[PDB]
Symmetry: D3
Subunit: 134 residues, 6 copies
């Protein structure tokens, strides 16, 4: 009696696989729920060296590759969550995010957690909506 909505798992070899029985992202109707991305190199399965700035760059690259696999780019992001091992890294992570966001300004929440998977210093979750968007 109701319409059947499209639900698609998004998969790309250009981002790491999720840790656990999870997908990199799920598109449902037009909304894309992207799993939290760490600064993990898809080729090594481990964090990139060099600390939070390098990890933020890698995490955002990983998000970007998942967005591309769903026909999207950073302009489609509507909400991000920035999870930090150290609140004092917030500015530095925001400076990296400003380099990837294609001038988009999604809503966001940010906070320091007690620990991230793989000893990460940053993890970014995102929600996007498939275009076209006004």
């Amino acid at each position: 009696h109701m319409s059947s909505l499209v639900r698609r798992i998004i998969s790309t070899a250009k981002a790491p696989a999720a840790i656990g029985p999870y997908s990199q992202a799920v598109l449902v109707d037009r909304t894309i729920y992207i799993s939290g991305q760490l600064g993990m190199d898809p080729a090594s399965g481990q964090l990139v060296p060099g600390g939070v700035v390098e990890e933020a760059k890698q995490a955002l690259t990983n998000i970007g590759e998942i967005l591309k696999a769903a026909g999207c780019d950073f302009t489609n992001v509507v909400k991000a969550t920035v999870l930090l091992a150290d609140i004092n890294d917030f500015s530095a992570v925001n400076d990296v995010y400003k380099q990837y966001f294609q001038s988009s300004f999604p809503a966001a929440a940010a906070y320091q957690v007690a620990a991230l998977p793989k000893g990460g210093r940053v993890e970014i979750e995102a929600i996007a909506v498939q275009g076209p968007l006004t």
Copy 2:
């Protein structure tokens, strides 16, 4: 001038009541926002004994009962958040989640928080979409 979308509070006696002025879940349009579930026994109002594995089983059972009250099951879950008191319990919680998920693979984020309500070792939030889904 715009359509009136369906918004329904989901309530079931087979899951604990939310802590505070919150509902167990809200269905709006076709999206179900499920409150974070702890390993609380609906009959005792307290955590089940035995630690994080037992609590994860109870939390997932609680999610399952809320999904059922909304006409859904684990195949409808599109995003989960796994909140942990100890990051080292992530694998063990993922092994329990693999027992309940009906082979679904939602998007996910996971991290260790400083503390959960009721001294919980695990809390799981979920977003589902009411079917049919492709």
Copy 3:
């Protein structure tokens, strides 16, 4: 080949500006993703004095002003996340939330984080849906 959905940035001078390259909220289709709000006075750019109860009041006022800028009020909220510097403040924050929620009962998650931006004791994120709603 697909409809173009409305995406609008919500901005109001009656709430503080977001910290970083983010918007106060984004409306997309009918869903409003509200950035996490701290107990920051829009006039000072700093936390209000007096502790978590005062900060919770200010954070909720800030959410309320963002909702109003999107044509909504607290009855439109469907999911909240209550982030705390101290889990022991959960009841006190819930008592403030009960004063602002216009009897709405959204789904919710709550937990203690390691740290919030600006040394906040509380941060509240929300998802709302633009009415009319049944």
Copy 4:
């Protein structure tokens, strides 16, 4: 990739059996396309006696039963077409029609055709939208 929309054939034995390769109505998404109804008795398939006024009443009754089978009533109708064998019957058929469409009057077109199946004096087609509808 696009959502799969609901498409259902509406069928009720309380409206006449088919006289051609046509469904009584088709619901698709929320819109209901109702076949043109004649003033035919549902049990026998024969036109009711009494001319255009009685045929109009029966045709509208038949539409009503099709609407009911789709979980609707006459308030769900948004467009009708009134096909007349004689334009002179315009006022008389309108008087019957107003008794069924008592509020939120549908959009309509009315005109005289050269002939209707079975020698009918009136045929009425309609489009409805499945509720809830907020007026």
Copy 5:
């Protein structure tokens, strides 16, 4: 449980008053069903003089005012039906019609009926969709 769709009667004094139990148009969700319009002067309710060409212009003007009341213009029309008293007028009415539907031409059907209300020579019905529409 289903969403409650918007259904609104469209009414403007800039188009003729009703000659039957019909709304000028009904907007439902985003689709606008427009009643068949004759070449009737809105103030008097009398057909305009001059035959089919003038009646067509007036009928289209009336449609235009109904569209305007629904926040639309002729570019929102997606389907029309041109009902003629005389098939020979097909080309002449098409020449008038093309002056109003200047782009994104609607789908249409055109044919001769036996008679129209008020002795009209042309009646035009339409379906439109409320914008924004992305062509």
Copy 6:
């Protein structure tokens, strides 16, 4: 503020060129309004010989090519209108029609008009909905 719905003109050289200011079909959101088709050969624009049965086959073939251009087939049709030059041809045209609409029969109206363009014996209009449709 409202979403911008897709509106596209459907056009195929495998169906006849226009005889008036009309699109072969208009897709809007998911609904396809198909212009009335005559039994016209697409290459020449001339009616096919053989009378109503052959004209019906050709008109339905033309609809089929328009549907194909919109990524649809006859199972996407939800409503048709069969306009006849002679009501006596009702049964014969229905026999042809059933060969194209072999399942999920559309809602329909059928009746005799006074005349069709080009002296046609039959004209068929349709509404379809772009799939996927779940019956």
